[PDB]
Tab-separated table of N, CA, C and O and ligand atoms in Angstrom:
chain	number	residue	atom	x	y	z
D	1	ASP	N	249.365	126.051	146.265
D	1	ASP	CA	249.446	127.150	147.213
D	1	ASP	C	248.211	128.038	147.124
D	1	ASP	O	247.887	128.752	148.061
D	2	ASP	N	247.522	127.995	145.989
D	2	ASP	CA	246.191	128.584	145.918
D	2	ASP	C	245.099	127.590	146.280
D	2	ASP	O	243.958	128.003	146.523
D	3	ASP	N	245.417	126.297	146.315
D	3	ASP	CA	244.512	125.291	146.852
D	3	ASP	C	244.485	125.291	148.374
D	3	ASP	O	243.841	124.418	148.963
D	4	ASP	N	245.178	126.237	149.016
D	4	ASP	CA	245.120	126.344	150.471
D	4	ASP	C	243.695	126.601	150.946
D	4	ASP	O	243.254	126.030	151.950
D	5	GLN	N	242.957	127.454	150.233
D	5	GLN	CA	241.561	127.693	150.583
D	5	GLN	C	240.684	126.508	150.195
D	5	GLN	O	239.772	126.132	150.941
D	6	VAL	N	240.945	125.910	149.031
D	6	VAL	CA	240.154	124.768	148.582
D	6	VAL	C	240.319	123.594	149.542
D	6	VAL	O	239.363	122.855	149.812
D	7	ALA	N	241.527	123.410	150.078
D	7	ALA	CA	241.759	122.330	151.032
D	7	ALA	C	241.069	122.613	152.360
D	7	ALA	O	240.370	121.750	152.904
D	8	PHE	N	241.262	123.821	152.898
D	8	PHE	CA	240.624	124.209	154.153
D	8	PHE	C	239.115	124.007	154.092
D	8	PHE	O	238.515	123.424	155.002
D	9	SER	N	238.487	124.477	153.012
D	9	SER	CA	237.041	124.339	152.874
D	9	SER	C	236.633	122.880	152.704
D	9	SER	O	235.571	122.468	153.186
D	10	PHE	N	237.462	122.084	152.025
D	10	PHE	CA	237.160	120.663	151.871
D	10	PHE	C	237.149	119.955	153.220
D	10	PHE	O	236.267	119.131	153.491
D	11	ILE	N	238.119	120.269	154.082
D	11	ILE	CA	238.154	119.681	155.418
D	11	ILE	C	236.943	120.124	156.227
D	11	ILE	O	236.318	119.320	156.929
D	12	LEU	N	236.594	121.411	156.140
D	12	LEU	CA	235.439	121.926	156.871
D	12	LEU	C	234.162	121.210	156.452
D	12	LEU	O	233.342	120.832	157.296
D	13	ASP	N	233.977	121.020	155.144
D	13	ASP	CA	232.778	120.350	154.652
D	13	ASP	C	232.683	118.926	155.182
D	13	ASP	O	231.606	118.479	155.593
D	14	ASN	N	233.804	118.198	155.187
D	14	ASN	CA	233.781	116.817	155.656
D	14	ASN	C	233.495	116.743	157.150
D	14	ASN	O	232.796	115.833	157.607
D	15	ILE	N	234.021	117.693	157.928
D	15	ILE	CA	233.676	117.765	159.345
D	15	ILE	C	232.168	117.886	159.514
D	15	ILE	O	231.566	117.223	160.368
D	16	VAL	N	231.533	118.723	158.691
D	16	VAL	CA	230.088	118.915	158.780
D	16	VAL	C	229.357	117.629	158.415
D	16	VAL	O	228.459	117.177	159.137
D	17	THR	N	229.738	117.013	157.294
D	17	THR	CA	228.981	115.881	156.774
D	17	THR	C	229.365	114.560	157.428
D	17	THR	O	228.501	113.694	157.605
D	18	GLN	N	230.637	114.379	157.787
D	18	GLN	CA	231.087	113.101	158.327
D	18	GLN	C	230.998	113.030	159.843
D	18	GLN	O	230.863	111.930	160.394
D	19	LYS	N	231.062	114.167	160.530
D	19	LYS	CA	231.111	114.185	161.986
D	19	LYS	C	229.904	114.864	162.611
D	19	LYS	O	229.261	114.280	163.492
D	20	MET	N	229.570	116.082	162.181
D	20	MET	CA	228.468	116.812	162.797
D	20	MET	C	227.116	116.248	162.374
D	20	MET	O	226.231	116.047	163.211
D	21	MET	N	226.936	115.991	161.076
D	21	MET	CA	225.691	115.402	160.597
D	21	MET	C	225.520	113.952	161.029
D	21	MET	O	224.461	113.369	160.769
D	22	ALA	N	226.523	113.363	161.677
D	22	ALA	CA	226.451	111.997	162.176
D	22	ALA	C	225.981	111.916	163.622
D	22	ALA	O	225.814	110.807	164.141
D	23	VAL	N	225.774	113.052	164.281
D	23	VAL	CA	225.286	113.038	165.665
D	23	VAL	C	223.894	112.416	165.695
D	23	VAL	O	223.053	112.741	164.832
D	24	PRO	N	223.603	111.505	166.625
D	24	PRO	CA	222.278	110.870	166.652
D	24	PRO	C	221.159	111.896	166.762
D	24	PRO	O	221.207	112.807	167.593
D	25	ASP	N	220.155	111.745	165.895
D	25	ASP	CA	218.958	112.589	165.887
D	25	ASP	C	219.289	114.056	165.629
D	25	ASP	O	218.587	114.953	166.103
D	26	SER	N	220.354	114.319	164.874
D	26	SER	CA	220.728	115.678	164.509
D	26	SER	C	220.035	116.156	163.240
D	26	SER	O	220.342	117.251	162.757
D	27	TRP	N	219.101	115.371	162.704
D	27	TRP	CA	218.468	115.734	161.441
D	27	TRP	C	217.701	117.059	161.457
D	27	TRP	O	217.613	117.680	160.384
D	28	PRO	N	217.128	117.544	162.571
D	28	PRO	CA	216.485	118.869	162.520
D	28	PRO	C	217.453	120.009	162.261
D	28	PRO	O	217.014	121.087	161.841
D	29	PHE	N	218.747	119.811	162.493
D	29	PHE	CA	219.745	120.848	162.273
D	29	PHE	C	220.457	120.707	160.936
D	29	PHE	O	221.353	121.503	160.639
D	30	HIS	N	220.078	119.719	160.120
D	30	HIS	CA	220.737	119.530	158.832
D	30	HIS	C	220.314	120.580	157.816
D	30	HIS	O	221.078	120.885	156.895
D	31	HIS	N	219.119	121.134	157.958
D	31	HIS	CA	218.521	121.983	156.940
D	31	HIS	C	217.851	123.174	157.603
D	31	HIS	O	217.574	123.147	158.807
D	32	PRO	N	217.593	124.246	156.847
D	32	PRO	CA	216.850	125.377	157.411
D	32	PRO	C	215.500	124.925	157.938
D	32	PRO	O	214.813	124.106	157.322
D	33	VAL	N	215.133	125.461	159.101
D	33	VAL	CA	213.901	125.054	159.758
D	33	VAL	C	212.724	125.302	158.830
D	33	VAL	O	212.549	126.404	158.301
D	34	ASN	N	211.925	124.260	158.610
D	34	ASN	CA	210.747	124.375	157.760
D	34	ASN	C	209.699	125.236	158.454
D	34	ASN	O	209.185	124.865	159.515
D	35	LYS	N	209.383	126.389	157.857
D	35	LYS	CA	208.369	127.268	158.428
D	35	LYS	C	207.005	126.594	158.495
D	35	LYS	O	206.177	126.970	159.331
D	36	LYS	N	206.764	125.594	157.643
D	36	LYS	CA	205.486	124.889	157.648
D	36	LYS	C	205.267	124.115	158.943
D	36	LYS	O	204.117	123.897	159.344
D	37	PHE	N	206.341	123.698	159.611
D	37	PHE	CA	206.229	122.875	160.811
D	37	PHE	C	206.346	123.665	162.105
D	37	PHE	O	205.764	123.261	163.116
D	38	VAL	N	207.085	124.766	162.107
D	38	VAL	CA	207.105	125.672	163.251
D	38	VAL	C	206.908	127.087	162.720
D	38	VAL	O	207.848	127.700	162.189
D	39	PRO	N	205.698	127.641	162.838
D	39	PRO	CA	205.386	128.867	162.084
D	39	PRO	C	206.108	130.100	162.593
D	39	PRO	O	206.484	130.963	161.790
D	40	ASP	N	206.318	130.209	163.900
D	40	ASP	CA	206.863	131.419	164.497
D	40	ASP	C	208.383	131.416	164.586
D	40	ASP	O	208.951	132.342	165.174
D	41	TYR	N	209.056	130.409	164.018
D	41	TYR	CA	210.499	130.288	164.209
D	41	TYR	C	211.235	131.515	163.686
D	41	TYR	O	212.108	132.067	164.366
D	42	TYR	N	210.899	131.954	162.478
D	42	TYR	CA	211.569	133.107	161.894
D	42	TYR	C	211.054	134.429	162.444
D	42	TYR	O	211.544	135.487	162.034
D	43	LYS	N	210.092	134.392	163.366
D	43	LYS	CA	209.655	135.588	164.073
D	43	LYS	C	210.387	135.793	165.393
D	43	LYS	O	210.365	136.907	165.930
D	44	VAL	N	211.030	134.756	165.923
D	44	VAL	CA	211.753	134.836	167.183
D	44	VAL	C	213.257	134.698	166.981
D	44	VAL	O	214.042	135.362	167.662
D	45	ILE	N	213.680	133.852	166.046
D	45	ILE	CA	215.087	133.731	165.681
D	45	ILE	C	215.366	134.701	164.541
D	45	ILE	O	214.797	134.572	163.452
D	46	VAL	N	216.241	135.677	164.788
D	46	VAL	CA	216.543	136.681	163.772
D	46	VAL	C	217.733	136.304	162.895
D	46	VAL	O	217.844	136.811	161.769
D	47	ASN	N	218.623	135.429	163.371
D	47	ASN	CA	219.777	134.957	162.605
D	47	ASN	C	219.722	133.435	162.547
D	47	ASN	O	220.477	132.749	163.254
D	48	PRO	N	218.847	132.868	161.716
D	48	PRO	CA	218.732	131.407	161.653
D	48	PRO	C	219.964	130.774	161.026
D	48	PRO	O	220.614	131.350	160.150
D	49	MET	N	220.279	129.564	161.486
D	49	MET	CA	221.503	128.892	161.076
D	49	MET	C	221.293	127.385	161.084
D	49	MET	O	220.585	126.855	161.944
D	50	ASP	N	221.923	126.703	160.126
D	50	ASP	CA	221.824	125.255	160.012
D	50	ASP	C	223.060	124.727	159.294
D	50	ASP	O	223.897	125.491	158.804
D	51	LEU	N	223.161	123.396	159.226
D	51	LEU	CA	224.343	122.777	158.636
D	51	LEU	C	224.355	122.896	157.117
D	51	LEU	O	225.428	123.028	156.520
D	52	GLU	N	223.182	122.859	156.475
D	52	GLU	CA	223.137	122.910	155.016
D	52	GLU	C	223.682	124.230	154.489
D	52	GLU	O	224.455	124.249	153.524
D	53	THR	N	223.297	125.346	155.108
D	53	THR	CA	223.781	126.640	154.650
D	53	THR	C	225.176	126.963	155.172
D	53	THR	O	225.831	127.860	154.630
D	54	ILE	N	225.652	126.256	156.202
D	54	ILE	CA	227.085	126.270	156.490
D	54	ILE	C	227.847	125.643	155.330
D	54	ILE	O	228.903	126.138	154.916
D	55	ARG	N	227.311	124.550	154.774
D	55	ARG	CA	227.956	123.903	153.636
D	55	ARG	C	227.918	124.790	152.399
D	55	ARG	O	228.883	124.830	151.626
D	56	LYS	N	226.808	125.503	152.187
D	56	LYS	CA	226.767	126.477	151.102
D	56	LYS	C	227.733	127.628	151.344
D	56	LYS	O	228.281	128.186	150.386
D	57	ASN	N	227.959	127.994	152.608
D	57	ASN	CA	228.973	128.999	152.910
D	57	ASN	C	230.376	128.444	152.696
D	57	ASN	O	231.276	129.169	152.257
D	58	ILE	N	230.580	127.162	153.008
D	58	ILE	CA	231.870	126.525	152.757
D	58	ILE	C	232.158	126.481	151.261
D	58	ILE	O	233.285	126.743	150.821
D	59	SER	N	231.143	126.157	150.455
D	59	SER	CA	231.336	126.067	149.011
D	59	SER	C	231.635	127.428	148.394
D	59	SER	O	232.331	127.503	147.375
D	60	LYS	N	231.121	128.506	148.985
D	60	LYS	CA	231.474	129.857	148.565
D	60	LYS	C	232.795	130.329	149.155
D	60	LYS	O	233.191	131.472	148.903
D	61	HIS	N	233.471	129.484	149.938
D	61	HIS	CA	234.740	129.828	150.584
D	61	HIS	C	234.589	131.061	151.474
D	61	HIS	O	235.396	131.992	151.434
D	62	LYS	N	233.532	131.059	152.290
D	62	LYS	CA	233.303	132.172	153.206
D	62	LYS	C	234.267	132.124	154.386
D	62	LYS	O	234.725	133.169	154.866
D	63	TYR	N	234.600	130.924	154.856
D	63	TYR	CA	235.410	130.751	156.055
D	63	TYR	C	236.878	130.623	155.664
D	63	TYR	O	237.284	129.620	155.065
D	64	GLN	N	237.674	131.640	156.002
D	64	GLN	CA	239.116	131.616	155.796
D	64	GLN	C	239.883	131.172	157.036
D	64	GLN	O	241.097	130.958	156.956
D	65	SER	N	239.203	131.045	158.173
D	65	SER	CA	239.772	130.477	159.383
D	65	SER	C	238.628	129.879	160.185
D	65	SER	O	237.459	130.208	159.967
D	66	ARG	N	238.969	128.985	161.114
D	66	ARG	CA	237.926	128.294	161.861
D	66	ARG	C	237.176	129.209	162.820
D	66	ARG	O	236.170	128.778	163.394
D	67	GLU	N	237.624	130.453	163.000
D	67	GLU	CA	236.935	131.365	163.908
D	67	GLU	C	235.574	131.772	163.354
D	67	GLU	O	234.565	131.732	164.067
D	68	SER	N	235.526	132.173	162.080
D	68	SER	CA	234.248	132.526	161.466
D	68	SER	C	233.379	131.297	161.243
D	68	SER	O	232.146	131.398	161.257
D	69	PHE	N	234.000	130.136	161.029
D	69	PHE	CA	233.247	128.892	160.904
D	69	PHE	C	232.542	128.550	162.211
D	69	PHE	O	231.361	128.185	162.219
D	70	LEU	N	233.253	128.685	163.336
D	70	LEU	CA	232.662	128.385	164.636
D	70	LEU	C	231.574	129.383	165.010
D	70	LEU	O	230.667	129.044	165.780
D	71	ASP	N	231.651	130.612	164.491
D	71	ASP	CA	230.623	131.606	164.783
D	71	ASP	C	229.253	131.134	164.316
D	71	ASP	O	228.257	131.283	165.036
D	72	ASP	N	229.182	130.556	163.117
D	72	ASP	CA	227.912	130.054	162.608
D	72	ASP	C	227.525	128.726	163.247
D	72	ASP	O	226.333	128.452	163.418
D	73	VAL	N	228.504	127.896	163.610
D	73	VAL	CA	228.196	126.640	164.287
D	73	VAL	C	227.599	126.913	165.663
D	73	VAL	O	226.563	126.347	166.032
D	74	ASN	N	228.244	127.787	166.441
D	74	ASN	CA	227.702	128.157	167.744
D	74	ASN	C	226.351	128.846	167.611
D	74	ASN	O	225.542	128.812	168.545
D	75	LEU	N	226.092	129.477	166.462
D	75	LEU	CA	224.809	130.134	166.238
D	75	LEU	C	223.666	129.128	166.196
D	75	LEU	O	222.538	129.456	166.582
D	76	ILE	N	223.933	127.905	165.731
D	76	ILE	CA	222.915	126.858	165.750
D	76	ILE	C	222.491	126.558	167.182
D	76	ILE	O	221.296	126.435	167.481
D	77	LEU	N	223.462	126.441	168.090
D	77	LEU	CA	223.148	126.150	169.485
D	77	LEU	C	222.484	127.340	170.165
D	77	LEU	O	221.550	127.166	170.958
D	78	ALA	N	222.955	128.556	169.874
D	78	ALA	CA	222.347	129.748	170.460
D	78	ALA	C	220.890	129.885	170.039
D	78	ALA	O	220.044	130.317	170.831
D	79	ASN	N	220.577	129.514	168.796
D	79	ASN	CA	219.201	129.606	168.320
D	79	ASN	C	218.323	128.537	168.958
D	79	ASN	O	217.144	128.782	169.242
D	80	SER	N	218.875	127.343	169.186
D	80	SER	CA	218.111	126.302	169.864
D	80	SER	C	217.842	126.677	171.315
D	80	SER	O	216.760	126.401	171.843
D	81	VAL	N	218.815	127.309	171.975
D	81	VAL	CA	218.603	127.767	173.345
D	81	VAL	C	217.544	128.860	173.383
D	81	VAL	O	216.654	128.854	174.243
D	82	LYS	N	217.614	129.811	172.447
D	82	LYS	CA	216.651	130.905	172.435
D	82	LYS	C	215.256	130.430	172.052
D	82	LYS	O	214.263	131.011	172.504
D	83	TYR	N	215.152	129.383	171.234
D	83	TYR	CA	213.838	128.884	170.852
D	83	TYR	C	213.364	127.721	171.715
D	83	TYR	O	212.229	127.736	172.198
D	84	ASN	N	214.198	126.700	171.901
D	84	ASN	CA	213.752	125.479	172.559
D	84	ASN	C	213.994	125.475	174.062
D	84	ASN	O	213.393	124.655	174.766
D	85	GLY	N	214.843	126.361	174.570
D	85	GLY	CA	215.156	126.385	175.978
D	85	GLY	C	216.437	125.637	176.284
D	85	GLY	O	216.889	124.787	175.510
D	86	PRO	N	217.048	125.939	177.432
D	86	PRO	CA	218.350	125.327	177.745
D	86	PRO	C	218.265	123.841	178.052
D	86	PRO	O	219.221	123.109	177.768
D	87	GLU	N	217.158	123.373	178.624
D	87	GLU	CA	217.004	121.974	179.001
D	87	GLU	C	216.378	121.128	177.902
D	87	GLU	O	216.048	119.963	178.146
D	88	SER	N	216.214	121.681	176.703
D	88	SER	CA	215.501	120.985	175.643
D	88	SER	C	216.288	119.779	175.143
D	88	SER	O	217.520	119.748	175.186
D	89	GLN	N	215.550	118.774	174.666
D	89	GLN	CA	216.188	117.643	174.002
D	89	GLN	C	216.858	118.084	172.707
D	89	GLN	O	217.920	117.570	172.340
D	90	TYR	N	216.248	119.042	172.004
D	90	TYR	CA	216.863	119.591	170.800
D	90	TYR	C	218.157	120.324	171.133
D	90	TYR	O	219.170	120.167	170.443
D	91	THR	N	218.137	121.135	172.195
D	91	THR	CA	219.322	121.896	172.575
D	91	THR	C	220.468	120.976	172.982
D	91	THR	O	221.634	121.245	172.666
D	92	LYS	N	220.156	119.879	173.676
D	92	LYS	CA	221.195	118.917	174.031
D	92	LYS	C	221.792	118.269	172.788
D	92	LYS	O	222.990	117.962	172.753
D	93	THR	N	220.974	118.060	171.753
D	93	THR	CA	221.489	117.519	170.499
D	93	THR	C	222.382	118.533	169.793
D	93	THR	O	223.463	118.189	169.299
D	94	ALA	N	221.942	119.794	169.733
D	94	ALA	CA	222.764	120.835	169.126
D	94	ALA	C	224.074	121.012	169.880
D	94	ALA	O	225.114	121.302	169.276
D	95	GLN	N	224.046	120.836	171.204
D	95	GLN	CA	225.274	120.917	171.987
D	95	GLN	C	226.262	119.832	171.572
D	95	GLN	O	227.477	120.064	171.552
D	96	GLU	N	225.761	118.643	171.229
D	96	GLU	CA	226.648	117.571	170.790
D	96	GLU	C	227.148	117.795	169.368
D	96	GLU	O	228.255	117.359	169.033
D	97	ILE	N	226.355	118.458	168.524
D	97	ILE	CA	226.859	118.901	167.226
D	97	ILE	C	228.032	119.852	167.423
D	97	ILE	O	229.093	119.701	166.806
D	98	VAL	N	227.855	120.843	168.300
D	98	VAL	CA	228.927	121.783	168.611
D	98	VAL	C	230.094	121.069	169.280
D	98	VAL	O	231.257	121.443	169.086
D	99	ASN	N	229.813	120.021	170.057
D	99	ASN	CA	230.881	119.327	170.769
D	99	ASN	C	231.755	118.520	169.814
D	99	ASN	O	232.987	118.616	169.857
D	100	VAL	N	231.137	117.718	168.941
D	100	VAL	CA	231.912	116.894	168.019
D	100	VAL	C	232.661	117.742	167.000
D	100	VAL	O	233.637	117.269	166.403
D	101	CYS	N	232.229	118.989	166.787
D	101	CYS	CA	232.922	119.889	165.871
D	101	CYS	C	234.195	120.436	166.507
D	101	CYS	O	235.267	120.404	165.894
D	102	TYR	N	234.086	120.947	167.736
D	102	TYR	CA	235.269	121.366	168.483
D	102	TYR	C	236.234	120.205	168.685
D	102	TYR	O	237.457	120.393	168.667
D	103	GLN	N	235.700	118.997	168.886
D	103	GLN	CA	236.538	117.819	169.090
D	103	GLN	C	237.446	117.575	167.891
D	103	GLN	O	238.674	117.509	168.023
D	104	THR	N	236.853	117.437	166.706
D	104	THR	CA	237.623	117.143	165.506
D	104	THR	C	238.387	118.350	164.980
D	104	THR	O	239.256	118.181	164.118
D	105	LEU	N	238.091	119.556	165.472
D	105	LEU	CA	238.898	120.715	165.105
D	105	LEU	C	240.244	120.692	165.818
D	105	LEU	O	241.280	120.983	165.209
D	106	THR	N	240.249	120.358	167.112
D	106	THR	CA	241.507	120.150	167.819
D	106	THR	C	242.199	118.870	167.370
D	106	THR	O	243.419	118.750	167.522
D	107	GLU	N	241.440	117.913	166.830
D	107	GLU	CA	242.038	116.735	166.210
D	107	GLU	C	242.940	117.128	165.045
D	107	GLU	O	244.012	116.541	164.854
D	108	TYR	N	242.522	118.122	164.259
D	108	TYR	CA	243.281	118.607	163.114
D	108	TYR	C	243.965	119.946	163.383
D	108	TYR	O	244.238	120.687	162.433
D	109	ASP	N	244.243	120.272	164.648
D	109	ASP	CA	244.673	121.627	164.993
D	109	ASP	C	245.963	122.009	164.273
D	109	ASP	O	246.027	123.040	163.594
D	110	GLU	N	247.009	121.189	164.422
D	110	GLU	CA	248.293	121.505	163.801
D	110	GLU	C	248.155	121.656	162.292
D	110	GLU	O	248.800	122.518	161.683
D	111	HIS	N	247.307	120.833	161.674
D	111	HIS	CA	247.143	120.876	160.225
D	111	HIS	C	246.405	122.138	159.790
D	111	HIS	O	246.823	122.820	158.847
D	112	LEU	N	245.300	122.462	160.468
D	112	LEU	CA	244.495	123.614	160.073
D	112	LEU	C	245.242	124.922	160.296
D	112	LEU	O	245.143	125.844	159.478
D	113	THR	N	245.990	125.022	161.399
D	113	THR	CA	246.757	126.233	161.671
D	113	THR	C	247.724	126.541	160.536
D	113	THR	O	247.939	127.710	160.194
D	114	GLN	N	248.321	125.506	159.939
D	114	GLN	CA	249.130	125.729	158.747
D	114	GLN	C	248.288	126.359	157.641
D	114	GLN	O	248.606	127.446	157.149
D	115	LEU	N	247.176	125.715	157.274
D	115	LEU	CA	246.337	126.245	156.203
D	115	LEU	C	245.823	127.646	156.524
D	115	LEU	O	245.739	128.497	155.632
D	116	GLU	N	245.493	127.914	157.790
D	116	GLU	CA	244.928	129.215	158.142
D	116	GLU	C	245.926	130.345	157.915
D	116	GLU	O	245.546	131.433	157.464
D	117	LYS	N	247.207	130.114	158.221
D	117	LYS	CA	248.208	131.156	158.008
D	117	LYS	C	248.568	131.298	156.534
D	117	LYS	O	248.790	132.414	156.053
D	118	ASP	N	248.627	130.184	155.800
D	118	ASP	CA	248.934	130.270	154.377
D	118	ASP	C	247.801	130.922	153.589
D	118	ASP	O	248.045	131.482	152.516
D	119	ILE	N	246.570	130.878	154.107
D	119	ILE	CA	245.462	131.551	153.434
D	119	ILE	C	245.546	133.053	153.656
D	119	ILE	O	245.317	133.847	152.735
D	120	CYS	N	245.901	133.462	154.880
D	120	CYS	CA	245.914	134.873	155.245
D	120	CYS	C	247.169	135.573	154.748
D	120	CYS	O	247.091	136.723	154.305
D	121	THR	N	248.332	134.908	154.810
D	121	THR	CA	249.545	135.507	154.260
D	121	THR	C	249.459	135.648	152.746
D	121	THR	O	250.101	136.531	152.166
D	122	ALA	N	248.673	134.791	152.093
D	122	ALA	CA	248.389	134.985	150.677
D	122	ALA	C	247.384	136.109	150.460
D	122	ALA	O	247.430	136.793	149.431
D	123	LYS	N	246.472	136.316	151.415
D	123	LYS	CA	245.514	137.412	151.302
D	123	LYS	C	246.210	138.764	151.375
D	123	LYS	O	245.833	139.702	150.664
D	124	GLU	N	247.227	138.882	152.229
D	124	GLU	CA	247.913	140.156	152.408
D	124	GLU	C	248.973	140.396	151.341
D	124	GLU	O	249.203	141.547	150.956
D	125	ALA	N	249.629	139.338	150.863
D	125	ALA	CA	250.596	139.470	149.783
D	125	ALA	C	249.933	139.667	148.426
D	125	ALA	O	250.619	140.040	147.468
D	126	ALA	N	248.625	139.426	148.324
D	126	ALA	CA	247.884	139.673	147.093
D	126	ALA	C	247.376	141.107	147.009
D	126	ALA	O	247.376	141.698	145.924
D	127	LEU	N	246.936	141.680	148.132
D	127	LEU	CA	246.567	143.089	148.153
D	127	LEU	C	247.776	144.006	148.295
D	127	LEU	O	247.648	145.214	148.067
D	128	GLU	N	248.937	143.467	148.656
D	128	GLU	CA	250.170	144.245	148.685
D	128	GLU	C	250.886	144.133	147.344
D	128	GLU	O	250.298	144.376	146.290
C	1	LIG	C1	208.666	116.053	161.844
C	1	LIG	O1	209.400	117.265	161.987
C	1	LIG	C2	209.799	117.910	160.849
C	1	LIG	C3	209.575	117.418	159.582
C	1	LIG	C4	210.010	118.120	158.463
C	1	LIG	C5	209.750	117.572	157.098
C	1	LIG	O2	209.982	118.243	156.092
C	1	LIG	N1	209.179	116.336	157.067
C	1	LIG	C6	208.223	115.923	156.038
C	1	LIG	C7	208.878	115.794	154.671
C	1	LIG	C8	207.852	115.353	153.644
C	1	LIG	N2	207.224	114.082	154.026
C	1	LIG	C9	206.241	113.677	153.011
C	1	LIG	C10	206.577	114.186	155.341
C	1	LIG	C11	207.563	114.605	156.413
C	1	LIG	C12	210.662	119.336	158.620
C	1	LIG	C13	210.893	119.842	159.881
C	1	LIG	C14	210.456	119.135	161.002
C	1	LIG	N3	210.664	119.574	162.330
C	1	LIG	C15	211.662	120.357	162.864
C	1	LIG	C16	212.799	120.754	162.110
C	1	LIG	C17	213.749	121.532	162.720
C	1	LIG	C18	213.571	121.897	164.050
C	1	LIG	C19	212.429	121.460	164.726
C	1	LIG	N4	211.497	120.700	164.131
C	1	LIG	N5	212.207	121.802	166.048
C	1	LIG	C20	211.083	121.264	166.815
C	1	LIG	C21	210.511	122.326	167.730
C	1	LIG	C22	210.744	123.698	167.120
C	1	LIG	C23	212.231	124.017	167.064
C	1	LIG	C24	213.062	122.771	166.744
C	1	LIG	C25	214.338	123.146	166.021
C	1	LIG	O3	215.166	123.845	166.582
C	1	LIG	N6	214.524	122.696	164.729
C	1	LIG	C26	215.766	123.077	164.033
């Protein structure tokens, strides 16, 4: 019952590594953008986001529900749109990363909703 968070985060990590990181040519979004290859990236993108640091956030148990998890996932696509443009080949790839994530989230919807409530009802019964 305290593994409710450990289970939720384990599922989130596998979604990232087994489904999102499996999108064809998604390798530029696997890791923080190398400043050596695009120098001005951190001068135009103020909230940079990638899959590797989503996984580091998962390992720190930052996401207690899929809402905050999706906030950082959608941030990858928002940053590609702001940097690469809406019609970019990179942006279309990031859109498919976001697509396969929403896909497998509704795939596990009934299961995750259980974990999400058991995590939060434990959060409130612990501070109460
Ligand atoms: C070849 O490319 C890269 C290589 C490497 C690299 O470490 N490779 C070397 C490793 C050592 N080895 C000895 C030699 C190879 C890193 C980044 C590249 N490019 C890239 C990454 C991410 C984005 C990106 N590019 N782009 C492209 C346009 C800017 C924005 C857009 C974008 O959103 N994103 C997230």
